[PDB]
Amino acid sequence: MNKGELVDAVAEKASVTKKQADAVLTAALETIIEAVSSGDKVTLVGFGSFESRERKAREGRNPKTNEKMEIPATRVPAFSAGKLFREKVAPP
Amino acid sequence: MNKGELVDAVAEKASVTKKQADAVLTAALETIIEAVSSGDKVTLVGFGSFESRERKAREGRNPKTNEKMEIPATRVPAFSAGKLFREKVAPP
DNA sequence: TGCATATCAATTTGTTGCA
DNA sequence: TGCATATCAATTTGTTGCACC
């Protein structure tokens, strides 16, 4: 399933337009990204949360030259699936 | 941020109602979960993808009885943030 | 796209049960 | 959500760069 297909399915459950539902899902996706980047945790009860996570510098290795090197510290977006989501993927 | 706060923020950006936007956002979240469960990979352009992943059985330990135990094989929801999301979180 | 080094290396998650 | 076990043990991603695996 892609964005479009999702938009289609959604328009139906809530009852709006393709243009509409698209506009709204987008608003949410861009807002999620913004919040996480700006250091906020996005929480969505049952579905899961999004957060940015710090990553320390770590040593890696050049597969070409075989030299040791340092992978600099970074920040990554992270997701944690909420309970309802986990339990639909793996029914207890 | 929470669903509600996301709802409030979303209603504005795309131009809808709070009861409306919510119902929409909800639709999408249920559908994502439903899709991922049935083995459907959800790929949203300019955000990331959701999929279900196999996990083999693995070793654990009962913190009560301190007995070694086997955690059964399962499936878990996984999120794969796209390039845009990653670059916003961590400018290149 | 996928896949590859390193006898990697920093990281995530789960295990019970109750608060 | 948290705590509290293992001198845990699977998991993930990335290092640079080809067209394999």
From Swiss-Prot, chains A, B:
Homodimer. One of its GO terms (molecular function) is structural constituent of chromatin. Transmembrane segments: none annotated. CDD domains: HU. GO terms for cellular component: cytosol. Pfam families: Bac_DNA_binding (PF00216). The gene is hup. This is DNA-binding protein HU. Keywords: DNA condensation, DNA-binding, Heterocyst. SUPFAM superfamilies: IHF-like DNA-binding proteins (SSF47729).
